[PDB]
Amino acid sequence: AKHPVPKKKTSKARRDARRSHHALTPPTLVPCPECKAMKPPHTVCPECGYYAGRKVLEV
Amino acid sequence: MRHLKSGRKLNRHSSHRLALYRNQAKSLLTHGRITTTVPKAKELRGFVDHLIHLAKRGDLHARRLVLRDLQDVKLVRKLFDEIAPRYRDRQGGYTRVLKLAERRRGDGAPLALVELVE
Amino acid sequence: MKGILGVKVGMTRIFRDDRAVPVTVILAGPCPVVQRRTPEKDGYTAVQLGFLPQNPKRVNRPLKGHFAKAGVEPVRILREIRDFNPEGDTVTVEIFKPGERVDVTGTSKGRGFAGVMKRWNFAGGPDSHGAHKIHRHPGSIGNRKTPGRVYKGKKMAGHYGAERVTVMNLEVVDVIPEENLLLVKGAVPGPNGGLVIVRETKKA
Amino acid sequence: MIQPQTYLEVADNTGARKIMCIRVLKGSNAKYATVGDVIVASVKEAIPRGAVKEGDVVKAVVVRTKKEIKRPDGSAIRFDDNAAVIINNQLEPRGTRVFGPVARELREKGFMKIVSLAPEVL
Amino acid sequence: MNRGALIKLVESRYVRTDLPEFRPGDTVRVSYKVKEGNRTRIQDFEGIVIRIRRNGFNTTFTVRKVSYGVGVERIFPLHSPLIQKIDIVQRGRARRAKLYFIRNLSDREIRRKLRADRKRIDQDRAAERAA
RNA sequence: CGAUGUCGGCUCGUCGCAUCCUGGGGCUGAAGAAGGUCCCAAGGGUUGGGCUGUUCGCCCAUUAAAGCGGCACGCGAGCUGGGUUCAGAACGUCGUGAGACAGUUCGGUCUCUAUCCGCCACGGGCGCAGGAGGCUUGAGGGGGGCUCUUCCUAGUACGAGAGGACCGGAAGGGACGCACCUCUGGUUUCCCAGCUGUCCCUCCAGGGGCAUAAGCUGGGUAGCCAUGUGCGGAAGGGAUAACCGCUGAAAGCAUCUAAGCGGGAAGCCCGCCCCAAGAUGAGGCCUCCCACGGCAGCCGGUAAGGACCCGGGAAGACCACCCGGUGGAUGGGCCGGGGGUGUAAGCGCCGCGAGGCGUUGAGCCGACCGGUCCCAAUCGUCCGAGGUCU
RNA sequence: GAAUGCCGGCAUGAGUAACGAUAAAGAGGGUGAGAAUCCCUCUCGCCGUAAGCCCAAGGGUUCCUACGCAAUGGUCGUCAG
RNA sequence: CGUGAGGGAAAGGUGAAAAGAACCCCGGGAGGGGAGUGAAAUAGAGCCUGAAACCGUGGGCUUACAAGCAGUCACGGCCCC
Ligand SMILES: [Mg+2]
Ligand SMILES: [Mg+2]
Ligand SMILES: [Mg+2]
Ligand SMILES: [Mg+2]
Ligand SMILES: [Mg+2]
Ligand SMILES: [Mg+2]
Ligand SMILES: [Mg+2]
Ligand SMILES: [Mg+2]
Ligand SMILES: [Mg+2]
Ligand SMILES: [Mg+2]
Ligand SMILES: [Mg+2]
Ligand SMILES: [Mg+2]
Ligand SMILES: [Mg+2]
Ligand SMILES: [Mg+2]
Ligand SMILES: [Mg+2]
Ligand SMILES: [Mg+2]
Ligand SMILES: [Mg+2]
Ligand SMILES: [Mg+2]
Ligand SMILES: [Mg+2]
Ligand SMILES: [Mg+2]
Ligand SMILES: [Mg+2]
Ligand SMILES: [Mg+2]
Ligand SMILES: [Mg+2]
Ligand SMILES: [Mg+2]
Ligand SMILES: [Mg+2]
Ligand SMILES: [Mg+2]
Ligand SMILES: [Mg+2]
Ligand SMILES: [Mg+2]
Ligand SMILES: [Mg+2]
Ligand SMILES: [Mg+2]
Ligand SMILES: [Mg+2]
Ligand SMILES: [Mg+2]
Ligand SMILES: [Mg+2]
Ligand SMILES: [Mg+2]
Ligand SMILES: [Mg+2]
Ligand SMILES: [Mg+2]
Ligand SMILES: [Mg+2]
Ligand SMILES: [Mg+2]
Ligand SMILES: [Mg+2]
Ligand SMILES: [Mg+2]
Ligand SMILES: [Mg+2]
Ligand SMILES: [Mg+2]
Ligand SMILES: [Mg+2]
Ligand SMILES: [Mg+2]
Ligand SMILES: [Mg+2]
Ligand SMILES: [Mg+2]
Ligand SMILES: [Mg+2]
Ligand SMILES: [Mg+2]
Ligand SMILES: [Mg+2]
Ligand SMILES: [Mg+2]
Ligand SMILES: [Mg+2]
Ligand SMILES: [Mg+2]
Ligand SMILES: [Mg+2]
Ligand SMILES: [Mg+2]
Ligand SMILES: [Mg+2]
Ligand SMILES: [Mg+2]
Ligand SMILES: [Mg+2]
Ligand SMILES: [Mg+2]
Ligand SMILES: [Mg+2]
Ligand SMILES: [Mg+2]
Ligand SMILES: [Mg+2]
Ligand SMILES: [Mg+2]
Ligand SMILES: [Mg+2]
Ligand SMILES: [Mg+2]
Ligand SMILES: [Mg+2]
Ligand SMILES: [Mg+2]
Ligand SMILES: [Mg+2]
Ligand SMILES: [Mg+2]
Ligand SMILES: [Mg+2]
Ligand SMILES: [Mg+2]
Ligand SMILES: [Mg+2]
Ligand SMILES: [Mg+2]
Ligand SMILES: [Mg+2]
Ligand SMILES: [Mg+2]
Ligand SMILES: [Mg+2]
Ligand SMILES: [Mg+2]
Ligand SMILES: [Mg+2]
Ligand SMILES: [Mg+2]
Ligand SMILES: [Mg+2]
Ligand SMILES: [Mg+2]
Ligand SMILES: [Mg+2]
Ligand SMILES: [Mg+2]
Ligand SMILES: [Mg+2]
Ligand SMILES: [Mg+2]
Ligand SMILES: [Mg+2]
Ligand SMILES: [Mg+2]
Ligand SMILES: [Mg+2]
Ligand SMILES: [Mg+2]
Ligand SMILES: [Mg+2]
Ligand SMILES: [Mg+2]
Ligand SMILES: [Mg+2]
Ligand SMILES: [Mg+2]
Ligand SMILES: [Mg+2]
Ligand SMILES: [Mg+2]
Ligand SMILES: [Mg+2]
Ligand SMILES: [Mg+2]
Ligand SMILES: [Mg+2]
Ligand SMILES: [Mg+2]
Ligand SMILES: [Mg+2]
Ligand SMILES: [Mg+2]
Ligand SMILES: [Mg+2]
Ligand SMILES: [Mg+2]
Ligand SMILES: [Mg+2]
Ligand SMILES: [Mg+2]
Ligand SMILES: [Mg+2]
Ligand SMILES: [Mg+2]
Ligand SMILES: [Mg+2]
Ligand SMILES: [Mg+2]
Ligand SMILES: [Mg+2]
Ligand SMILES: [Mg+2]
Ligand SMILES: [Mg+2]
Ligand SMILES: [Mg+2]
Ligand SMILES: [Mg+2]
Ligand SMILES: [Mg+2]
Ligand SMILES: [Mg+2]
Ligand SMILES: [Mg+2]
Ligand SMILES: [Mg+2]
Ligand SMILES: [Mg+2]
Ligand SMILES: [Mg+2]
Ligand SMILES: [Mg+2]
Ligand SMILES: [Mg+2]
Ligand SMILES: [Mg+2]
Ligand SMILES: [Mg+2]
Ligand SMILES: [Mg+2]
Ligand SMILES: [Mg+2]
Ligand SMILES: [Mg+2]
Ligand SMILES: [Mg+2]
Ligand SMILES: [Mg+2]
Ligand SMILES: [Mg+2]
Ligand SMILES: [Mg+2]
Ligand SMILES: [Mg+2]
Ligand SMILES: [Mg+2]
Ligand SMILES: [Mg+2]
Ligand SMILES: [Mg+2]
Ligand SMILES: [Mg+2]
Ligand SMILES: [Mg+2]
Ligand SMILES: [Mg+2]
Ligand SMILES: [Mg+2]
Ligand SMILES: [Mg+2]
Ligand SMILES: [Mg+2]
Ligand SMILES: [Mg+2]
Ligand SMILES: [Mg+2]
Ligand SMILES: [Mg+2]
Ligand SMILES: [Mg+2]
Ligand SMILES: [Mg+2]
Ligand SMILES: [Mg+2]
Ligand SMILES: [Mg+2]
Ligand SMILES: [Mg+2]
Ligand SMILES: [Mg+2]
Ligand SMILES: [Mg+2]
Ligand SMILES: [Mg+2]
Ligand SMILES: [Mg+2]
Ligand SMILES: [Mg+2]
Ligand SMILES: [Mg+2]
Ligand SMILES: [Mg+2]
Ligand SMILES: [Mg+2]
Ligand SMILES: [Mg+2]
Ligand SMILES: [Mg+2]
Ligand SMILES: [Mg+2]
Ligand SMILES: [Mg+2]
Ligand SMILES: [Mg+2]
Ligand SMILES: [Mg+2]
Ligand SMILES: [Mg+2]
Ligand SMILES: [Mg+2]
Ligand SMILES: [Mg+2]
Ligand SMILES: [Mg+2]
Ligand SMILES: [Mg+2]
Ligand SMILES: [Mg+2]
Ligand SMILES: [Mg+2]
Ligand SMILES: [Mg+2]
Ligand SMILES: [Mg+2]
Ligand SMILES: [Mg+2]
Ligand SMILES: [Mg+2]
Ligand SMILES: [Mg+2]
Ligand SMILES: [Mg+2]
Ligand SMILES: [Mg+2]
Ligand SMILES: [Mg+2]
Ligand SMILES: [Mg+2]
Ligand SMILES: [Mg+2]
Ligand SMILES: [Mg+2]
Ligand SMILES: [Mg+2]
Ligand SMILES: [Mg+2]
Ligand SMILES: [Mg+2]
Ligand SMILES: [Mg+2]
Ligand SMILES: [Mg+2]
Ligand SMILES: [Mg+2]
Ligand SMILES: [Mg+2]
Ligand SMILES: [Mg+2]
Ligand SMILES: [Mg+2]
Ligand SMILES: [Mg+2]
Ligand SMILES: [Mg+2]
Ligand SMILES: [Mg+2]
Ligand SMILES: [Mg+2]
Ligand SMILES: [Mg+2]
Ligand SMILES: [Mg+2]
Ligand SMILES: [Mg+2]
Ligand SMILES: [Mg+2]
Ligand SMILES: [Mg+2]
Ligand SMILES: [Mg+2]
Ligand SMILES: [Mg+2]
Ligand SMILES: [Mg+2]
Ligand SMILES: [Mg+2]
Ligand SMILES: [Mg+2]
Ligand SMILES: [Mg+2]
Ligand SMILES: [Mg+2]
Ligand SMILES: [Mg+2]
Ligand SMILES: [Mg+2]
Ligand SMILES: [Mg+2]
Ligand SMILES: [Mg+2]
Ligand SMILES: [Mg+2]
Ligand SMILES: [Mg+2]
Ligand SMILES: [Mg+2]
Ligand SMILES: [Mg+2]
Ligand SMILES: [Mg+2]
Ligand SMILES: [Mg+2]
Ligand SMILES: [Mg+2]
Ligand SMILES: [Mg+2]
Ligand SMILES: [Mg+2]
Ligand SMILES: [Mg+2]
Ligand SMILES: [Mg+2]
Ligand SMILES: [Mg+2]
Ligand SMILES: [Mg+2]
Ligand SMILES: [Mg+2]
Ligand SMILES: [Mg+2]
Ligand SMILES: [Mg+2]
Ligand SMILES: [Mg+2]
Ligand SMILES: [Mg+2]
Ligand SMILES: [Mg+2]
Ligand SMILES: [Zn+2]
């Protein structure tokens, strides 16, 4: 190869337009039925250790 | 393509992946419950279930087969005398995987507990 | 024109007149008529066939209203056969007899992102004699300053498969109405378990 | 499945022992010859004082191949060597006898004389 | 639906059961139906079966023999209607499923490697004592 | 000249037509068959080798044919580096010499990261005046487009003979394309077995690691595949080219033409296959929800619906797509079947022993075809109409 | 306002290449504000004419212990030349 | 930096006075928020003034059928005085 190189500096506009897909999506969170704490669905609650209505974990 | 191909690779060559499964088995049978990454936890279900099922048959042949993977005679003795009898009436499902809420700090990996069922 | 929706079940071979005949087995009917397309109402003629009954607890209201207006149980797939107006309200394998030729349409198997050698049967490069990291590469894609661009439709790497493909003029080898089974000589696009359409051939 | 450069045993008594295919006489650009197809070949080995000698450009028909032959009855046949019988432009054999079995496909292709000279037709 | 059973169903009309069980290493005579013009005849093909390729109805087996100085192998659909009958000529004991290695063996060495399977030769003699 | 890399090859094409072949023609010093010559025609096709760096060319074996040119003598941020023009060395030759020649001869560093346009694929956004779930029309694009042999007609027409048709009909091929895995043939990184050396568990027996990122070897399912299998080129309709006519003046005859009509190509339009309503010209049909509160606008709660999350998938780089989420067989286990391997271990018996025999087609056993709630898809959250004006 | 000017600052390329041998990891326990990365235990793998041990050059406190983590360490760090 | 001869930098400024921010609060710390000092604290020590490139937060106008050395001339719409 022969070392490709940018021909022009990218403009502020074109740099930030390329970043129009970069914003984060917030985490998916549901309340724990036992302790009402927000937490990801399908995970053992990190605040009380309950899953499927029963204690699984010391926390 | 990967069409209808079974089995994760876990970025390990063949003998390392096998030694991973054997090692996680020993740890799971020793402690009853371990924490790993979700994909490792999922793959370990089938590996250990098979060894528990051979312990349920209980014969000499089964004991020698299980020892190929577990090597620890005291551990196999524990699997035959204490673990396997509590699954006499249970047909499969000797292990469960549950996903943990918090990822690991240094690499973001999602984690899961694997455990023997009651 | 006559047609029916089906499932590709598998391949085998039968023996006919001391010849081994490769066959694809297709589970075709039965297909209820769910809607008819007319020139007055829709500007053309076709029958919308239904196929594979569905758990109603999976069928939302606008679909349910569509079925109920036809007095039809909830079905998994709706597809139209162009220029087909069957007399009955249910299309079955008996629209085809052994000896007829058919066109079969399915979704071909998906290669995903495919190289130039698998997708376009390019020759690739030499594997020795100094060849340098181009063993599977396409080679040149153009000229120089004239025209200074690459043609539309240039054959290049990309997704390949998982697309509609029609194979034409396949001999119907057997029809087994008891099990809604069509036997078609030869190969038929897609995986076992894939949805297919069987139509009367357009080859005279 | 014979192509240019393939060596073939000579299953006749013309004096040739080994021939090397230089053409598959099957249209503009056939890639392979199988049983029943004619080839052009160079004679690479011959016994002293035969009908054909080393260096002769000859025609021959393929009578058995190592690549198995598929038949419409769903069966197949395969031989241990690649063998040919030297012929003249009228498809008749240039020798008087034929050694080893030959594929039955030959009969259907019009090499009736070679088929009947053979000791076995498989 | 059950796609395997539907396939086995389509196949059921062609499955035969008149033929005798055999193993790689057995010597088998296949009476095979053959066309030639303007007649059709039965030709016997006798040799060692070096391979059984199992896929239910699509099972095939391969028989090797030497004919006039030249080795010949035939592949047969195990349920082909062109097979009139198969006769067991000898039971051989092999130590493996595929006997490809015998293609590179002298006649002597083959005889040394595939000796007569006494247990199954006696099994055939025990049966064949019918009422 | 603050650099536009230079022969040939490979790869990948695309275009011109002054056409090599195939299709259509007129003239022939065209009996037939085969040619010659010119006209129309660029749809497709245009082989494999020996020599040489070669382009070219000659030659071998075929072929319907083995066309010629353009694209920076197309294509080195695509590859090669044999040719050729750096430094070494030598021959011929020239020069007193240092050196020189394009003359010859052997050798001689070819740079991981693509910003923009372009190209192949895939999404995200918004739009298509209510919000939705489906099913579609096809404007417009693309793909494809080749050809030979044998037989019948008929050994007929034609010809002294040799030879040998038109038209019409049938079968079989070559190369190419799309799909497929039943068969044939591959692979199959751990599915099974055998083997060596060493270390180890536990001494025997039985096993484990390592010898490659399989230690080696013999096999090998699903999948992915070609060497394997099916299928395609059309048919047909329409309008034409050269060319041939009908009727027919100007021009009492004649003339295919000035009015008018017909025939006529592998080529053109359609027909086949694939994409396609961002076709902003944003199309059509079926069905679903409803005119909700508070100040062509805002705010909030909802509907039909959807998304999130999770189990997954012959779908896939991520994304997307598709299935399923306890009213569940989605994956994992377990069970049956298929399939591979080819008779486990233990025990008994024979042998001094290596081993052999029996139990036993045993044991092991990925993916394939199913069954089964044993394990896991718990529990939930968020978004989403109130339909502008004439 | 230009001298491929000079010095400095700050952009673009871009969240891109890369993170330096394909000998390889897993779990449990501990510590801590924080742990894939520190300590301990068990299992696994790699070297073993070395990838082990001794000596001479050269280097010059890098040695040992306690306390610590801003920077240095291609990540992290409670660890450390 | 260079074996060496030799080459050879960058780097100034709180305030009149340290009065250099006790104490409380979040934090492991860093950092900040109060309190307090000062005429002044965007003079708080990474300190006079504090330009420009460059980066960001908020607001007005504007933009998803469009062809561009990016301006200019015109008219209209919206927002502001
Ligand atoms: Mg390169
Ligand atoms: Mg390059
Ligand atoms: Mg490059
Ligand atoms: Mg390179
Ligand atoms: Mg580069
Ligand atoms: Mg540039
Ligand atoms: Mg900006
Ligand atoms: Mg951009
Ligand atoms: Mg707590
Ligand atoms: Mg794929
Ligand atoms: Mg791969
Ligand atoms: Mg997988
Ligand atoms: Mg799977
Ligand atoms: Mg595995
Ligand atoms: Mg791997
Ligand atoms: Mg990785
Ligand atoms: Mg690793
Ligand atoms: Mg290894
Ligand atoms: Mg290893
Ligand atoms: Mg996954
Ligand atoms: Mg879970
Ligand atoms: Mg999570
Ligand atoms: Mg960490
Ligand atoms: Mg489909
Ligand atoms: Mg490629
Ligand atoms: Mg290919
Ligand atoms: Mg392809
Ligand atoms: Mg190639
Ligand atoms: Mg090459
Ligand atoms: Mg190649
Ligand atoms: Mg190189
Ligand atoms: Mg290189
Ligand atoms: Mg290479
Ligand atoms: Mg390339
Ligand atoms: Mg241009
Ligand atoms: Mg796709
Ligand atoms: Mg039939
Ligand atoms: Mg399939
Ligand atoms: Mg000679
Ligand atoms: Mg012979
Ligand atoms: Mg099947
Ligand atoms: Mg059934
Ligand atoms: Mg015979
Ligand atoms: Mg024999
Ligand atoms: Mg019969
Ligand atoms: Mg220049
Ligand atoms: Mg420059
Ligand atoms: Mg320049
Ligand atoms: Mg330059
Ligand atoms: Mg060209
Ligand atoms: Mg012309
Ligand atoms: Mg021409
Ligand atoms: Mg002509
Ligand atoms: Mg003449
Ligand atoms: Mg003529
Ligand atoms: Mg002519
Ligand atoms: Mg003309
Ligand atoms: Mg053309
Ligand atoms: Mg063209
Ligand atoms: Mg051309
Ligand atoms: Mg040539
Ligand atoms: Mg050569
Ligand atoms: Mg040579
Ligand atoms: Mg050459
Ligand atoms: Mg040449
Ligand atoms: Mg020349
Ligand atoms: Mg010459
Ligand atoms: Mg010819
Ligand atoms: Mg010709
Ligand atoms: Mg040119
Ligand atoms: Mg020139
Ligand atoms: Mg020139
Ligand atoms: Mg050039
Ligand atoms: Mg050229
Ligand atoms: Mg070039
Ligand atoms: Mg280059
Ligand atoms: Mg070049
Ligand atoms: Mg270039
Ligand atoms: Mg370049
Ligand atoms: Mg380039
Ligand atoms: Mg060179
Ligand atoms: Mg070189
Ligand atoms: Mg040279
Ligand atoms: Mg030369
Ligand atoms: Mg120099
Ligand atoms: Mg030189
Ligand atoms: Mg030189
Ligand atoms: Mg010399
Ligand atoms: Mg001289
Ligand atoms: Mg001179
Ligand atoms: Mg001179
Ligand atoms: Mg002189
Ligand atoms: Mg002199
Ligand atoms: Mg000079
Ligand atoms: Mg010179
Ligand atoms: Mg020169
Ligand atoms: Mg010389
Ligand atoms: Mg050299
Ligand atoms: Mg040279
Ligand atoms: Mg260099
Ligand atoms: Mg470079
Ligand atoms: Mg990069
Ligand atoms: Mg780019
Ligand atoms: Mg540009
Ligand atoms: Mg979109
Ligand atoms: Mg979108
Ligand atoms: Mg319409
Ligand atoms: Mg169109
Ligand atoms: Mg358009
Ligand atoms: Mg078209
Ligand atoms: Mg005749
Ligand atoms: Mg006559
Ligand atoms: Mg004809
Ligand atoms: Mg044809
Ligand atoms: Mg298969
Ligand atoms: Mg296969
Ligand atoms: Mg097969
Ligand atoms: Mg096979
Ligand atoms: Mg194993
Ligand atoms: Mg060992
Ligand atoms: Mg020992
Ligand atoms: Mg010990
Ligand atoms: Mg031992
Ligand atoms: Mg070891
Ligand atoms: Mg080692
Ligand atoms: Mg190793
Ligand atoms: Mg091994
Ligand atoms: Mg070996
Ligand atoms: Mg094999
Ligand atoms: Mg193998
Ligand atoms: Mg396979
Ligand atoms: Mg092929
Ligand atoms: Mg016409
Ligand atoms: Mg006339
Ligand atoms: Mg007239
Ligand atoms: Mg006149
Ligand atoms: Mg006219
Ligand atoms: Mg006309
Ligand atoms: Mg006309
Ligand atoms: Mg006419
Ligand atoms: Mg054609
Ligand atoms: Mg479509
Ligand atoms: Mg639309
Ligand atoms: Mg559409
Ligand atoms: Mg438009
Ligand atoms: Mg619409
Ligand atoms: Mg809802
Ligand atoms: Mg997935
Ligand atoms: Mg992602
Ligand atoms: Mg969707
Ligand atoms: Mg959907
Ligand atoms: Mg769903
Ligand atoms: Mg749910
Ligand atoms: Mg429920
Ligand atoms: Mg399930
Ligand atoms: Mg299941
Ligand atoms: Mg199973
Ligand atoms: Mg079985
Ligand atoms: Mg079996
Ligand atoms: Mg035994
Ligand atoms: Mg004894
Ligand atoms: Mg089984
Ligand atoms: Mg459950
Ligand atoms: Mg049930
Ligand atoms: Mg909840
Ligand atoms: Mg100036
Ligand atoms: Mg510059
Ligand atoms: Mg510069
Ligand atoms: Mg510049
Ligand atoms: Mg400067
Ligand atoms: Mg300046
Ligand atoms: Mg400067
Ligand atoms: Mg600067
Ligand atoms: Mg930057
Ligand atoms: Mg920079
Ligand atoms: Mg990224
Ligand atoms: Mg990253
Ligand atoms: Mg980039
Ligand atoms: Mg990248
Ligand atoms: Mg680096
Ligand atoms: Mg990277
Ligand atoms: Mg590196
Ligand atoms: Mg590394
Ligand atoms: Mg730990
Ligand atoms: Mg811990
Ligand atoms: Mg850590
Ligand atoms: Mg930490
Ligand atoms: Mg590490
Ligand atoms: Mg430690
Ligand atoms: Mg040693
Ligand atoms: Mg030092
Ligand atoms: Mg010390
Ligand atoms: Mg120290
Ligand atoms: Mg310490
Ligand atoms: Mg630090
Ligand atoms: Mg730190
Ligand atoms: Mg820190
Ligand atoms: Mg400090
Ligand atoms: Mg650092
Ligand atoms: Mg760090
Ligand atoms: Mg470093
Ligand atoms: Mg600390
Ligand atoms: Mg350190
Ligand atoms: Mg130390
Ligand atoms: Mg120096
Ligand atoms: Mg110094
Ligand atoms: Mg100096
Ligand atoms: Mg200074
Ligand atoms: Mg001071
Ligand atoms: Mg001061
Ligand atoms: Mg403070
Ligand atoms: Mg404090
Ligand atoms: Mg604190
Ligand atoms: Mg605190
Ligand atoms: Mg502080
Ligand atoms: Mg604060
Ligand atoms: Mg104050
Ligand atoms: Mg004042
Ligand atoms: Mg100020
Ligand atoms: Mg101030
Ligand atoms: Mg002052
Ligand atoms: Mg200041
Ligand atoms: Mg400042
Ligand atoms: Mg802003
Ligand atoms: Mg427009
Ligand atoms: Mg607009
Ligand atoms: Mg303007
Ligand atoms: Mg104006
Ligand atoms: Zn909770």
B100 touches chain A (CB under 8 A): yes
**Selection from C22, C26, C25, C23 nearest residue C5 by Cα:** C26
**Site from D66, D73, D81, D105 to mutate, E interface, most E CB atoms within 10 angstroms:** D73
Q: Which two tokens stand for residue B51?
A: 């060894």
**Selection from B89, B62, B87, B63 nearest residue B77 by Cα:** B63
Alpha-carbon distances, residue D33 vs C61, D57, D101, E71 (angstroms)? 65, 17, 18, 20
Amino acid letter for position C4: I
Alpha-carbon distances, residue B42 vs B107, B118, D71 (angstroms)? 19, 18, 49
Q: Which ligand is nearest to the CA of A7?
A: 6
Q: Is residue B3 part of a domain?
A: no
**Selection from E66, E58, E65, E62 nearest residue E50 by Cα:** E62
Residues in CB range of C109: below 8 A, 6 or more apart = B3, C161, C162, C189, C190, C191
Q: Cis omega (within 30 of 0) on the bond before C85?
A: no
Q: Which ligand is nearest to the CA of C133?
A: 33
Amino acid letter for position E16: R
**DSSP 8-state assignment for residue D68:** P
E77 touches chain C (CB under 8 A): yes
User: Cα separation of C171 and D73, whole Å?
Assistant: 18
| Helices and strands, counts by H and E, chain B | 4, 3
Touch test D–B: 3 Cβ pairs or more under 8 Å: no
Question: Does residue C180 approach strand F to less than 7 Å at its CB?
Answer: no
**Selection from D1, D75, D79, D8 nearest residue E71 by Cα:** D79
Query: Which residues are found with C-beta within 5 Å of the ion, ligand 14?
Result: B 7
**Residue C116 in contact with residue C155, Cβ under 8 Å?**
yes
**Selection from C38, C49, C45, C46 nearest residue C90 by Cα:** C49
C-alpha dihedral (E86, E89, E90, E96), degrees to nearest 10: -40
Q: Which of B98, B101, B113 sits opposite A46 (nearest CB)?
A: B101
HSE of D77 in the Cβ direction (CA atoms, 13 Å)?
25
User: Is B115 exposed, middle or buried, given 0-12, 13-18 or 19+ CB atoms closer than 10 A?
Assistant: middle
- State whether B101 and A56 contact (CB < 8 Å): no
Report the SS3 class of residue E86: strand
Report the SS3 class of residue C25: strand
Q: Order the strands of the C75-82 sheet from edge to edge.
A: C75-82, C46-53, C31-37, C90-91
**Selection from C100, C114, C95 nearest residue C30 by Cα:** C95
Domain count for chain B: 1
The alpha carbon of residue B1 is apart from the nearest alpha carbon of chain C, in Å, by 6
Q: Is residue B115 part of a domain?
A: yes
| Helices and strands, counts by H and E, chain A | 1, 4
SS (H, E, C) D73-109: CCCEEEECCCEEEEECCCCCECCCCECCCECCHHHHH
The alpha carbon of residue B11 is apart from the nearest alpha carbon of chain C, in Å, by 21
Q: Is residue B27 part of a domain?
A: yes
**Selection from C155, C172, C163 nearest residue C194 by Cα:** C163
**Selection from C46, C167, C182, C173 nearest residue C107 by Cα:** C167
Q: Which of E7, E57, E80 sits opposite C9 (nearest CB)?
A: E7
**Selection from C7, D53, D69 nearest residue E6 by Cα:** C7
Alpha-carbon distances, residue C76 vs C35, C164, C198, D3 (angstroms)? 15, 19, 18, 54
Contacts of C111 in chain B (CB under 8 A): 1
Distance B9 CA to ligand 188 centre (A): 19
Domain of residue B44 covers 14-118
Question: Does residue C134 approach strand F to less than 7 Å at its CB?
Answer: yes
User: Cα separation of B3 and D105, whole Å?
Assistant: 40
Backbone angles phi, psi at A42, to 5 degrees: 65, 20
User: Cα separation of D78 and D66, whole Å?
Assistant: 6
User: Cα separation of C53 and C67, whole Å?
Assistant: 11
Report the SS3 class of residue B102: coil
C111 touches chain B (CB under 8 A): yes
User: The domain that contains B82 carries what CATH number?
Assistant: 3.90.1030.10
Q: Which residues of D41-76 are buried (b: 16+ CB within 10 A; e: fewer)?
A: bebeebeeebbbeeebebbbbbbbbeebbebebbbb
Q: Which nucleotide is nearest to A16 (CA to C1')?
A: G14
Q: Cis omega (within 30 of 0) on the bond before C62?
A: no
**Site from D9, D70, D80, D121 to mutate, E interface, most E CB atoms within 10 angstroms:** D80
Q: Is residue B92 part of a domain?
A: yes
C119 touches chain B (CB under 8 A): no
**Selection from C114, C11, C58, C134 nearest residue B1 by Cα:** C114
Report the SS3 class of residue A21: helix
Q: Is residue B94 part of a domain?
A: yes
Q: Which two tokens stand for residue C115?
A: 């190289």
Residues in CB range of A32: below 8 A, 6 or more apart = A38, A39, A45, A47, A48, A50
User: Cα separation of B95 and B114, whole Å?
Assistant: 7
Alpha-carbon distances, residue E20 vs C204, D76, E33, E85 (angstroms)? 48, 21, 18, 9
Taking the CA of residue D117 and the C1' sugar atom of nucleotide H17, their distance in angstroms comes to 131
DSSP of C133-190: S-TT-------BTTB-S--TT---SEE-SSSEEEEEEEEEEEEEGGGTEEEEES--SS
**Selection from D47, D75, D77, D63 nearest residue D118 by Cα:** D63
- State whether D72 and C15 contact (CB < 8 Å): no
- C116 φψ region: left (φ > 0), alpha (ψ -120 to 50), beta (else): alpha
Report the SS3 class of residue E85: strand
Residues in CB range of A12: below 8 A, 6 or more apart = none
Distance C55 CA to ligand 38 centre (A): 26
Distance B107 CA to ligand 175 centre (A): 28
Amino acid letter for position C201: T
Q: Is residue B9 part of a domain?
A: no
Report the SS3 class of residue C96: coil
Residues 97-116, chain C, CB closer than 7 Å to nucleic strand F? 103, 105, 108-113
Report the SS3 class of residue E87: strand
Q: Is residue B7 part of a domain?
A: no
User: Cα separation of B48 and B115, whole Å?
Assistant: 10
**DSSP 8-state assignment for residue C94:** G
**Selection from E62, E26, E61, E31 nearest residue E45 by Cα:** E31
**Selection from D42, D122, B35 nearest residue E64 by Cα:** D122
Backbone angles phi, psi at C156, to 5 degrees: -145, 170
Strands of chain C, DSSP E: 3-15, 20-27, 31-37, 46-53, 75-82, 90-91, 101-107, 113-114, 158-159, 164-176, 181-185, 195-200
**DSSP 8-state assignment for residue E58:** G
Question: Does residue C131 approach strand F to less than 7 Å at its CB?
Answer: yes
Q: Which two tokens stand for residue C97?
A: 């007899």
**DSSP 8-state assignment for residue D121:** B
Question: Does residue A47 approach strand H to less than 7 Å at its CB?
Answer: no
Q: How many CB atoms lie within 10 A of CB E117?
A: 18
Chain B residues within 8 Å of chain C (Cβ atoms): 1, 3
Report the SS3 class of residue E50: strand
The alpha carbon of residue E93 is apart from the nearest alpha carbon of chain D, in Å, by 24
Which helix (H) or strand (E) segment is E48 a member of? Answer: strand E40-53
Q: Is residue B8 part of a domain?
A: no
Q: Which experiment gave this structure? A: X-ray
How long, in residues, is chain A? 59
Report strand pairing: D7-10 vs D83-87: parallel
- State whether D104 and E36 contact (CB < 8 Å): yes
Q: Which nucleotide is nearest to E21 (CA to C1')?
A: F361
- In chain C, the residue whose alpha carbon lies closest to the alpha carbon of D72 is C19
**Residue E97 in contact with residue E43, Cβ under 8 Å?**
no
A33 touches chain B (CB under 8 A): no
C62 touches chain B (CB under 8 A): no
Question: Does residue A16 approach strand H to less than 7 Å at its CB?
Answer: yes
**DSSP 8-state assignment for residue A24:** P
**Residue D83 in contact with residue D55, Cβ under 8 Å?**
no
Amino acid letter for position E62: T
User: Cα separation of D74 and D79, whole Å?
Assistant: 17
Place of tokens 């190592």: D66
Contacts of E13 in chain C (CB under 8 A): 14
- In chain B, the residue whose alpha carbon lies closest to the alpha carbon of C110 is B1
Place of tokens 């006499």: B88
